[PDB]
Amino acid sequence: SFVEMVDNLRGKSGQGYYVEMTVGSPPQTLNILVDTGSSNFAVGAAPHPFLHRYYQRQLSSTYRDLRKGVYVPYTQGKWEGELGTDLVSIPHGPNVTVRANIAAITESDKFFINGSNWEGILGLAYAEIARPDDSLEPFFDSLVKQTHVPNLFSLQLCGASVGGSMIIGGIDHSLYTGSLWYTPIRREWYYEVIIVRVEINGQDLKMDCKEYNYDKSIVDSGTTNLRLPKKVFEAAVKSIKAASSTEKFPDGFWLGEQLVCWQAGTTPWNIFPVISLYLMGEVTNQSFRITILPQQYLRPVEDVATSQDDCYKFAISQSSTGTVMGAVIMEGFYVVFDRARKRIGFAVSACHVHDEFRTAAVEGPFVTLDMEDCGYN
Numbered sequence: 001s002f003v004e005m006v007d008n009l010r011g012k013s014g015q016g017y018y019v020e021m022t023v024g025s026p027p028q029t030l031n032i033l034v035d036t037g038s039s040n041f042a043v044g045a046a047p048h049p050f051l052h053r054y055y056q057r058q059l060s061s062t063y064r065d066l067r068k069g070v071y072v073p074y075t076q077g078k079w080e081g082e083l084g085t086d087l088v089s090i091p092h093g094p095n096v097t098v099r100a101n102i103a104a105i106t107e108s109d110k111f112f113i114n115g116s117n118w119e120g121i122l123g124l125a126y127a128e129i130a131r132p133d134d135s136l137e138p139f140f141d142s143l144v145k146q147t148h149v150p151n152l153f154s155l156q157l158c159g160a161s162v163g164g165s166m167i168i169g170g171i172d173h174s175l176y177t178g179s180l181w182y183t184p185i186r187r188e189w190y191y192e193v194i195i196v197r198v199e200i201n202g203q204d205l206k207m208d209c210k211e212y213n214y215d216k217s218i219v220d221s222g223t224t225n226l227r228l229p230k231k232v233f234e235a236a237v238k239s240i241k242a243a244s245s246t247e248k249f250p251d252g253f254w255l256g257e258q259l260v261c262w263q264a265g266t267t268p269w270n271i272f273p274v275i276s277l278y279l280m281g282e283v284t285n286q287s288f289r290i291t292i293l294p295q296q297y298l299r300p301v302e303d304v305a306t307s308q309d310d311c312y313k314f315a316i317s318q319s320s321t322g323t324v325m326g327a328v329i330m331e332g333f334y335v336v337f338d339r340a341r342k343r344i345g346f347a348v349s350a351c352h353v354h355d356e357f358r359t360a361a362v363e364g365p366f367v368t369l370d371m372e373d374c375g376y377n
């Protein structure tokens with residue numbers, strides 16, 4: 001019955017993917033951003049200039065107050081609100097209703113996005129990073145505990161105004177090609193993984209692999225960019241600059257501050273390298289790789305002035321809290337969050353954006369010694 005969940009995600013480029021949900025009795029319809037980088041379910045519950053609608057607790061006969069405040073800070077944006085519970089369902093999801101924790105957002109800062117079309121957030125990671133503490137059961141944990149929905153979900157994020165699929169409770173084999181390759185979930189808090197090697201156009205970065213996971217490496221559908229630790233970010237930019245040196249860039253480009261343009265249909269894709277991220281595999285000394293095309297990390301932006309050119313922003317940015325494999329990474333793949341088996345699977349997506357001479361790929365097996373030493377402690 002997973003066909004009913006195909007294409008249940010929508011969004012605007014760079015503003016997150018959202019799924020339709022209902023909260024309360026009678027059901028109140030809201031668009032909810034799907035965020036594997038957090039663990040709180042929260043909805044706008046008060047007027048806001050960027051919200052077209054919001055959760056009205058007074059209108060729901062099943063709302064229960066928890067008499068507890070909550071605050072959640074993200075990499076960018078934060079909100080505070082009032083905790084409670086209510087009945088929740090997903091129209092284009094499993095035919096079930098659960099009572100879940102809901103944070104009613106009463107104040108926020110740089111969280112809601114003007115014209116994004118979403119009014120709340122669905123944190124899909126584990127209780128350990130839920131606020132105020134890990135006793136606030138996350139939505140998916142409630143879903144699994146109260147229903148027969150199996151303990152896994154998959155995300156197919158399709159780039160260029162954006163769409164995709166969140167298959168709740170399973171894997172839809174019509175959505176990917178080739179084989180699924182699995183990497184262990186290192187610890188159940190974020191969806192934390194271990195990167196064991198990085199190559200750019202086939203050349204190893206030759207860094208200590210701990211640098212790739214310095215702090216941690218996570219998979220986050222709610223982050224646009226590929227975010228890399230300082231040292232790794234500098235090495236990658238140096239390599240990408242060198243490969244594309246024949247062209248001129250405002251250099252504010254490499255910081256994401258300025259966009260670059262080219263005459264329509266003349267973008268020199270060939271001069272931007274592919275990036276291969278090798279992930280720890282399921283068996284001893286085995287890994288696999290996922291390869292990213294420049295069409296993934298050069299995010300297209302509509303030039304509001306002379307719509308005569310193809311303009312792009314550099315979607316690789318520096319981090320101080322570890323690697324984040326955001327939408328730039330996920331959009332090329334079908335990603336399985338196999339919570340039951342503590343693993344994350346990657347396969348080439350059926351909605352992969354590919355050029356004419358290169359192809360995004362998930363390839364294995366590879367042999368990699370001492371993968372355990374790549375995790376940071």
Ligand SMILES: CCCCNC(=O)[C@H](C)C[C@H](O)[C@@H]1C[C@H](C)CCCCCCCC(=O)N[C@@H](C)C(=O)N1
Pocket residue numbers: 014015016017033035036037038039072073074075076077078111129131220221222223224225324
């Ligand atoms: C409290 C512990 C959990 C905290 N988790 C996080 O902060 C994760 C890593 C980031 C979240 O996914 C947050 C989620 C944000 C609020 C909402 C999504 C907005 C759409 C895309 C916005 C552009 C973007 O790329 N935002 C990143 C920087 C971001 O902060 N992402």
